[PDB]
Design an enzyme around this catalytic site. Structure first.
Site: not given
Ligand SMILES: Nc1nc2c(ncn2[C@@H]2O[C@H](COP(=O)(O)OP(=O)(O)OP(=O)(O)O)[C@@H](O)[C@H]2O)c(=O)[nH]1
Ligand SMILES: [Mg+2]
Ligand SMILES: Nc1nc2c(ncn2[C@@H]2O[C@H](COP(=O)(O)OP(=O)(O)O)[C@@H](O)[C@H]2O)c(=O)[nH]1
Ligand SMILES: Nc1nc2c(ncn2[C@@H]2O[C@H](COP(=O)(O)OP(=O)(O)O)[C@@H](O)[C@H]2O)c(=O)[nH]1
Lengths: 440, 609, 427, 48, 427
Positions: A11, A71, A140, A144-145, A179, A206, A228, A254
């Site tokens: 995400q 998801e 990140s 999850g993924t 989070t 973050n 972002n 490089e």
């Molecule tokens: N840089 C950045 N980090 C983010 C943002 N939104 C969420 N995160 C980070 O991403 C973490 C969770 O996001 P993901 O790793 O993408 O979670 P996911 O892939 O949806 O995992 P699942 O729903 O179980 O499939 C959080 O702990 C945040 O720290 C964003 O908009 N920008």
């Molecule tokens: Mg997700």
């Protein structure tokens, strides 16, 4: 000009990629429909898009990217958003079940259901590429993924594509704010693949970004979009010389040999210097020295780890805009002569300067005021070891009571890998404290 | 620097396709003559000049309104050509429109004037769409496929969205214009298995069918509304060297040309000739005087014709050198005869009314020299072969030829006033001295000093010596009576013209350094050093027979009136676009005439007795 | 007769050679389209030494442009005088050298060396007697250093009696633009000391002072930082294409600047450098001409001549000059300053005037000195190699393409052995 | 998530499209297909 | 008064041959209809060699056009130069030789032979003294492999003393377009060794390579590939149609290039091949035509000429050239490459100059040679034969129109003896 694809997973990774590809298409000129308003004949053909775009014949330029999240909510909003004609539907691969903030159903159980389709689609981009330099993979470390599926990619892309500069743009979790609750687990169980087939693991948490937006950018209550936009301008100096001309052109290969001293040590930071808002942009002069000084300052950094309690070992300094070389090497000289900024004895040299001729393009609606002379620094310091150590304390506390484990082991993952990731982190922390003693 | 007057122009660049044109006011012709485009008046000697352009123009495109005239030049490969819009009413530059690298082949305007198609380059062929309103680019695409070749023709239609190109490689493609998305959409026209090479396009007045003239000698008529062929050309008795000009009439007919000059008016279904008249030279342009009763045909050996449709009777109204013209010289005494001298041809002309009376063609050969003997009984010529051919003033027969005169060509030549000696220059740098007997033409001496090449011979008024300008920086006063030298005049310039001042004591020299300098005949010292033209070099001079005025022209495409005693300048120019090669004061001191690198013979009313 | 083709290599070499082929082209007289619209015929007769010929007066540069990435080929062609180079000499590759010396020498340069040698082996046989080859490069980077020195060794075997001079950009003191620069410079002169006749050493920080404390340019670009080198490079080969009173070609300098065969690292210098405001307040007579070129400020290699002896001396003078003064001033440099000259060579002067000056300037010189302050250039690359070699640093990107740790000692041995020779004679 | 790309039709900066990376070695060296070198100059070969 | 009959067979033969009729009609000044409009009288003085005369002075090619399908017959007829051809010389079948050496030689090809050979008799007896016959046949496929070689045998039995030239597209190993092209070539070689005086082999692999690294073309098509082939074909017959300082007909470069009685498989090549991009940035002189000839690039018979020695090479030049520098360069290539030519022949190079060059240029040349490396062009098909003949693969088609497997074994044996005799005369 050469090519590089960008595999956004998580995400986080696709929402970073939302701000990235908005900036990307604006720099070259691709509209959200996917077409350039000027043709290749009109302009003395400018193949600056080729690093991130690919022509089809009707002028339909194409993001060289693969959005993946297991998801289906954050990927359907880019098949229904304003950038829905720009992307390709086969590029936007999505799944049914969530990873549910769990490493086990990102790598072993749920992740195997779409590992075939993505590796086919990496092949489609790689075949039509002729000079594919690096995989710019956005994710990140705290979900999850972004903790899961990216580890299965890192192993598969190394067996398939071998030496193709597997870079990694990553989001570390923060010291205090978080989070997730299970975040320490999936942040050190996936760093196996990070200290394995991945050559340069760029780091951002973050928390530091919120502080930059408040102090420098003068917005209270910041959202995730402004966080972002900073990451997008970080890429746009890393991939500026691959897209635009400059005095010292600096390739993506490089970057590695100018920043990784040892094969284990491959974790840089990132810092954008002239990141100020428009009302305090009439105010500062912003020539060259104050921004060379800016990245070298604690309250401008993008990761909550202070470089003063550590020693630099490699620092490539990438410049854009109207940067004159004498102004750099004077700014290089004046900051190499400061006691608090320490460089290790086995790097007498110092910095890798990269000068580019394209000023940064501002995103309409973005915070960042235009600056005609910008800096994006990629440091490499021993001070990142305290960032690895704070989650080490947090992991060791909630693993000694064996908490939040029955979600993990009961999803296709063995218990033994938990202890393996434990000893693996001890080795990397021992490596960073080892590489920074002065032998005398 | 008072302008003299520019009366009368001979010249036409027929080698371009779709050249000579008549704007819909039906009172002036328009044709290209170098890096300029002329406007000659019908039924009036009045003629004007469109300046601009760096190198030679290859295209003209006039509007159906007549208000806009465009053009396009060639340049060195890698450099960008310039499409220059104009206004016919005020004759002034209004756009430069530089996109196409290499050069241009064809331009066409939109029906009502708001777009210009300017397909350009055998090196950078890519069709573009211009704006006549914004003076700016709109669309752009490659004009030919990657399997096929390159396209050299354009045309519009009766609706401003169609734009059509043919090729010398068969790219028959009917495009359509899509302003909101700023792109063009092609459609290749199926023609069966008839891959051909075609170089001319014309369309019907009611937008039915477009017509092609191929290299095979075949009129291809095809449909732009079903993208298919309709009718092939003559089954038997096909045309000559390919149809290089087609002009579809308001009827169902078409005036089809050829590479020989076989202008044919034929109908659609059989493409069989109805009325045939043979033109000299390959037909490169068939215009219509509006309604079409008086269509003017232009040919590559540049001869503008005038044909009435209802009788097919011609009138040669313009005749030009179709190649580079070098050396204008006048017969002794009279000033009403020229010697316009060029590749493949030697001509004479009547001064008052420009009309040629003798054309002397020696096949595919070049003559760098011409001269008139004092008795007026032989036109001495210096050809590139190395033979001094002497043709007869009337008829044109070859009285004698001096075989193997000089090795690398005979460049510069001059007769003597006794009509017995022809002093000859050479591209190897040799000055030969021949004896012209009644039956023999022998050699008397081979004087060899000059290393590079000889450029200009001049003989004095009562023969004892001659000066020979040369390309190696030397000008020798050879002693003609005792067959020796007398001087070693030396400079760091590639000399290109030298002249004897009357009351011979000093010679005037020209060259590449633009340092027009008087040189003495005794001790060979510098006398003055005038600055020529600030742009290029000086090719050619002529001092009047009273020694008060010497005229000057050069690479700077511009005739320059200079009086002698003081070095002041009575500059005029605004002449012809093309490197002025030689110039000659008329014997009666009444005109001054210059030739140019593109075939052009200019006359100026000589002031200053 | 005498022939020099120009082997510009690397990013830096292609940029300087672009600047170099401009200053030749406005001296001999060449348009962007390769045609002569110059002034004198005292300007064409020896245009052979740098320019080939095509039809219609179309003098073409005798240069083989080579760079592993295809990016710098674009910059040279899109430059102002880029429409002159022949499109067969452009030998580029696919993957860049990464500023990695063996990425330029042993593993991607190995498949380009057999292709760039062919092009050199075409512009060498169109020569009646080719003097030798000039190779513009940089010792700091990759393909300039790695591939460039690979060309040097291959050429030195193919043509073993020709003047191999190299115009090098050797690392700067304090300014550093590559953290890989210590290794790249060390391996290059391990191959440059034995296979090259005249290594002219051009720094960067030295030229930074010249454009500020001598020329007073507030915002100088790399073009002005290559014009000084290009003016030097025109200066060396001046009595070879234009007439002179006392002539001196590349070998006559070479026989007079290399006492001992290893010892050949020289120091360029351009004498008439006037600031724009301070231009009318300075007489253009030979006494100031000799002073400024020996002055330690106008010294485009960051090695102060007051920190060492100064074995062999050049003054390739240009312009219409009286020969007494270039014997008086050069004597005055020697006799008055009898300390910064070796006592074991009697007279160290190789004054040689030309007749044709550079465009504009009616007076000129070219300072080429074999000082023993050169060791300071190769001690600093010897202390930061050993600092970085002590604990094995950036070698995983050095041994992976296939090399050994044995070659680092052999390269570093050739460093201090070279420095020991300049220290043997420093006394 | 729609905030990414709302004000895209209100440009604040006209883009300075000058310091690009326009490919010239791949587009001015390599011709498409004519074999012109051993072809005649032919129809319309006006030279500078 | 020494005429040539131009036979052409197959889709490839009809396409290359029609391209040949375009380049002769340009050099001899024939418009697309057929009327003479060339300027020089040196063109009309030998219009008899490749052409005939008709009513109204419409010159007609002396060609017999044969294919077993009317597919390429209509392509040649409906082409740019397609009306010059005689409308009865278009003699063709309708069924089709679906790739099989059987389907041209022992069936349907063998009923059209009795009709096409009447045209050959009619054309050869309209000549005063015919010099010989040339045929364009693709060695891989139907009509060319089979019926074309069948036509060779009949004409050789009828006219045994007139020469027989064959320009053949031999199947390339990398560029492959049919799977049975090993079978067709091995059966075609046997009737090209005893019934042919010169076999010019022109494979498609080198022709693609010249149009990529020499002509520098992004997208070559079948048209310009045959234009290189037609240039060579109009390089060996040029001193039969134009005057020259040292004339050489089609028999003189057969008596001076065929050492031993079989020994006649040659390798073509053109001298002045340049890209349009280069063209202007390059001069056209005799010592650079000879470098462009004696190499790998311009050898359109793709076969490494450095892995074997030339028995006898000739070079037929065309232009205004002097006889010293031509003979000097032919001498120099022998001395500096003394290991690339056999030693039992003192002079290995033959010289011919033809004054009149092709249209366009002012200078050209042609390079045909008897390299002993041509066995490499014959080993590969043998390798592609034995690894296809071992398991009787794709052979049931061949033994259907009547063909024993004993013909297959003897054809491979004869072709291996062809490799043998070139292998004996290496040293
Ligand atoms: N840089 C950045 N980090 C983010 C943002 N939104 C969420 N995160 C980070 O991403 C973490 C969770 O996001 P993901 O790793 O993408 O979670 P996911 O892939 O949806 O995992 P699942 O729903 O179980 O499939 C959080 O702990 C945040 O720290 C964003 O908009 N920008
Ligand atoms: Mg997700
Ligand atoms: N004088 C000069 N130095 C340059 C120029 N471009 C780069 N450099 C120097 O070259 C060094 C890096 O060389 P690099 O470009 O990496 O060479 P590469 O191996 O070919 O890529 C830097 O320290 C620069 O100071 C130039 O145009 N002029
Ligand atoms: N160079 C060249 N080769 C061709 C052309 N047309 C066909 N070929 C070759 O001919 C081979 C096939 O020959 P084919 O048509 O089967 O011969 P056919 O059966 O006698 O008509 C292919 O491998 C092609 O490479 C051409 O126009 N030019």
């Amino acid at each position: 000009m050469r090519e590089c694809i960008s595999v956004h997973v998580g995400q986080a990774g696709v929402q970073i990629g939302n701000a990235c590809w908005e900036l990307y298409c604006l720099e070259h000129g691709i509209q959200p429909d996917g077409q350039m308003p000027s043709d290749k004949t009109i302009g003395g053909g400018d193949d600056s898009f080729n690093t991130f775009f690919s022509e089809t014949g009707a002028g339909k330029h194409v993001p060289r990217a693969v959005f993946v999240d297991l998801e289906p909510t954050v990927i359907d909003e880019v098949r229904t958003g304003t950038y829905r004609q720009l992307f390709h539907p086969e590029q936007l691969i999505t799944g049914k079940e969530d990873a549910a903030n769990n490493y086990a159903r990102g790598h072993y159980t749920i992740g195997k259901e779409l590992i075939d389709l993505v590796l086919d689609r990496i092949r489609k981009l790689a075949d039509q590429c002729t000079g594919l330099q690096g995989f710019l993979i956005f994710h990140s470390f705290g979900g999850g993924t972004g903790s899961g599926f990216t580890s299965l990619l890192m192993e598969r892309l190394s067996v398939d594509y071998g030496k193709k500069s597997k870079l990694e743009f990553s989001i570390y979790p923060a010291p205090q704010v978080s989070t997730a609750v299970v975040e320490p687990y999936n942040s050190i169980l996936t760093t196996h693949t990070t200290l394995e087939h991945s050559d340069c693991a760029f780091m951002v948490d973050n928390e530091a970004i919120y502080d930059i937006c408040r102090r420098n950018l003068d917005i209270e209550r910041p959202t995730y979009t402004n966080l972002n936009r900073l990451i997008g301008q970080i890429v746009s100096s890393i991939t500026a010389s691959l897209r635009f001309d400059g005095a010292l052109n600096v390739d993506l290969t490089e970057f590695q040999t100018n920043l990784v001293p040892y094969p284990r040590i491959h974790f840089p930071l990132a810092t954008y210097a002239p990141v100020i808002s428009a009302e305090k942009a009439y105010h500062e002069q912003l020539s060259v020295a104050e921004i060379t000084n800016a990245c070298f300052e604690p309250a401008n950094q993008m990761v909550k780890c202070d470089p003063r309690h550590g020693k630099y070992m490699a620092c490539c300094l990438l410049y854009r805009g109207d940067v004159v070389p004498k102004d750099v090497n004077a700014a290089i000289a004046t900051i190499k002569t400061k006691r608090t900024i320490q460089f290790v004895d086995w790097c007498p040299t110092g910095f890798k300067v990269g000068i580019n001729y394209q000023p940064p393009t501002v995103v309409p609606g973005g915070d960042l005021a235009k600056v005609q002379r910008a800096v994006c620094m990629l440091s490499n310091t021993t001070a990142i070891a305290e960032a690895w150590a704070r989650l080490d304390h947090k992991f060791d506390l909630m693993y000694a009571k064996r908490a939040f484990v029955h979600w993990y082991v009961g999803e296709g993952m063995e218990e033994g890998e938990f202890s393996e990731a434990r000893e693996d982190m001890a080795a990397l922390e021992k490596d960073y404290e080892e590489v920074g003693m002065d032998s005398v | 620097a008072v302008e003299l007057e520019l009366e009368a122009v001979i010249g036409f660049n027929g080698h371009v396709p779709t050249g000579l044109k008549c704007h819909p006011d039906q009172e002036h012709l328009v044709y290209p003559l170098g890096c300029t485009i002329l406007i000659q008046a019908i039924n009036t000697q009045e003629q004007n000049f469109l300046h601009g352009h760096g190198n030679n123009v290859s295209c003209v495109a006039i509007s159906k309104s007549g208000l806009y005239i465009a053009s396009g030049q060639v340049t060195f490969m890698g450099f960008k050509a310039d499409i220059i819009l104009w206004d016919y009413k005020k004759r002034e530059l209004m756009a430069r429109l530089s996109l196409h690298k290499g050069k241009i082949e064809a331009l066409a305007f939109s029906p009502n004037d708001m777009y210009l198609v300017s397909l350009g380059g055998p090196d950078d062929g890519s069709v573009v769409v211009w704006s006549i309103a914004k003076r700016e680019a709109i669309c752009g695409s490659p004009a030919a496929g990657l399997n096929v070749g390159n396209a050299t023709t354009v045309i519009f239609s009766k609706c401003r969205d169609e734009m059509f190109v043919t090729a010398g490689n068969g790219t028959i493609r009917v495009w359509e214009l899509d302003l909101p998305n700023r792109k063009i959409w092609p459609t290749e026209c199926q023609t069966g298995q008839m891959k051909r090479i075609v170089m001319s396009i014309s369309m019907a007045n009611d937008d039915s069918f477009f017509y092609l003239g191929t290299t095979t000698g075949d009129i291809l008529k095809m449909n732009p509304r079903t993208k298919l062929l309709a009718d092939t050309g003559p089954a038997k008795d096909k045309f000559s060297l390919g149809v290089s000009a087609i002009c579809c009439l308001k009827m169902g007919g078409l005036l089809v040309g050829s590479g020989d000059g076989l202008l044919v008016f034929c109908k659609s279904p059989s493409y069989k000739p109805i009325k045939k008249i043979q033109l000299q030279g390959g037909i490169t342009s068939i215009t219509l005087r509006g309604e079409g009763h008086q269509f003017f045909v232009g040919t590559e050996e540049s001869h503008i014709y005038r044909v009435n449709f209802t009788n097919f009777k011609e009138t040669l109204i313009t005749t030009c050198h179709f190649e580079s013209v070098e050396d204008i010289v006048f017969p002794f005494g009279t000033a009403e005869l020229f010697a316009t001298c060029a590749k493949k041809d030697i001509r004479v002309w009547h001064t008052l009314t420009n009309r040629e009376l003798l054309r002397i063609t020696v096949p595919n050969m070049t003559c760098h020299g011409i001269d008139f003997m004092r008795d007026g009984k032989s036109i001495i010529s210096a050809w590139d072969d190395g033979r001094i051919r002497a043709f007869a003033p009337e008829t044109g027969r070859l009285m004698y030829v001096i075989n193997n005169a000089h090795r690398i060509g005979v460049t510069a030549i001059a007769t003597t006033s006794d009509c017995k000696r022809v002093i000859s220059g050479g591209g190897e740098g040799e000055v030969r001295v021949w004896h012209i007997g009644h039956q023999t033409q022998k050699l008397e001496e081979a004087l060899k000093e000059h290393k590079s090449s000889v450029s200009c011979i001049r003989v004095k008024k009562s023969n004892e010596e001659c000066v020979t300008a040369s390309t190696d920086g030397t000008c020798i006063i050879w002693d003609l009576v005792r067959l020796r030298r007398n001087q070693m005049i030396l400079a760091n310039t590639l000399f290109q013209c030298v002249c004897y001042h009357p009351e011979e004591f000093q010679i005037i020299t020209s060259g590449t350094d633009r340092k027009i300098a008087y040189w003495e005949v005794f001790d060979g010292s510098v006398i003055r050093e005038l600055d020529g033209s600030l742009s290029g070099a000086v090719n050619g001079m002529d001092i009047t027979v009273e020694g008060v005025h010497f005229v000057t022209g050069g690479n700077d495409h511009l005739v320059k009136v200079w009086d002698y005693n003081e070095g002041e300048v009575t500059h005029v120019g605004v002449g012809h676009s093309g490197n002025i090669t030689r110039i000659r004061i008329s014997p009666g001191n009444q005109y001054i005439v210059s030739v140019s690198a593109d075939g052009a013979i200019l006359r100026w009313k000589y002031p200053f007795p | 007769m005498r022939e020099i083709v120009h082997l510009q290599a690397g990013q830096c070499g292609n940029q300087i050679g672009a600047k170099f082929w401009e200053v030749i082209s406005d001296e001999h007289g060449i348009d962007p389209t390769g045609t002569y619209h110059g002034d004198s015929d005292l300007q064409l007769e020896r245009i052979n030494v740098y320019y080939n010929e095509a039809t219609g007066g179309k003098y073409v540069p005798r240069a083989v442009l080579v760079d592993l990435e295809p990016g710098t080929m674009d910059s040279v062609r899109s430059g102002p005088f880029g429409q002159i180079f022949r499109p067969d000499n452009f030998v580029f590759g696919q993957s860049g050298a990464g500023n990695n010396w063996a990425k330029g020498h042993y593993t991607e340069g190995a498949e380009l060396v057999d292709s760039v040698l062919d092009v050199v082996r075409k512009e060498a046989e169109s020569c009646d007697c080719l003097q030798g080859f000039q190779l513009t490069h940089s010792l700091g980077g990759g393909t300039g250093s790695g591939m460039g020195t690979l060309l040097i060794s291959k050429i030195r075997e193919e043509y073993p009696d020709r003047i191999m001079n190299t115009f090098s950009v050797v690392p700067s003191p304090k300014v550093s633009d590559t953290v890989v620069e210590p290794y790249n410079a060390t391996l290059s002169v391990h191959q440059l000391v034995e296979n090259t006749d005249e290594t002219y050493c051009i720094d960067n920080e030295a030229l930074y002072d010249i454009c500020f404390r001598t020329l007073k340019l507030t915002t100088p670009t790399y073009g002005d930082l290559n014009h000084l080198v290009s003016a030097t490079m025109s200066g060396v080969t001046t009595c070879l294409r234009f007439p002179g009173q006392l002539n001196a070609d590349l070998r006559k300098l070479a026989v007079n600047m290399v006492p001992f065969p290893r010892l050949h690292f020289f120091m360029p210098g351009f004498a008439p450098l006037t600031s724009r405001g301070s231009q009318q307040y300075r007489a253009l007579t030979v006494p100031e001409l000799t002073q400024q070129m020996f002055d330690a400020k106008n010294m485009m290699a960051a090695c102060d001549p007051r920190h060492g002896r100064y074995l062999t001396v050049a003054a390739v003078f240009r312009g219409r000059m009286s020969m007494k003064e270039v014997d008086e001033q050069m004597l005055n440099v020697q006799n008055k300053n009898s300390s910064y000259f070796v006592e074991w060579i009697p007279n160290n002067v190789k004054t040689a005037v030309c007749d044709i000056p550079p465009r504009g300037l009616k007076m000129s010189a070219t300072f080429i000195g074999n000082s023993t302050a050169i060791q300071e250039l190769f001690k600093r690359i010897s202390e930061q190699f050993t600092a970085m070699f002590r604990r094995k640093a950036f070698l995983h990107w050095y041994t992976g393409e296939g090399m050994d740790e044995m070659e680092f000692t052999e390269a570093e041995s050739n460093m201090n052995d070279l420095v020991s020779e300049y220290q043997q004679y420093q006394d | 998530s729609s905030v990414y790309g709302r004000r895209i039709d209100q440009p604040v900066e006209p883009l300075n499209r000058d310091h690009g990376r326009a490919g010239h070695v791949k587009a001015d060296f390599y011709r498409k297909n004519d074999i012109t070198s051993i072809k005649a100059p032919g129809f319309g070969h006006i030279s500078p």
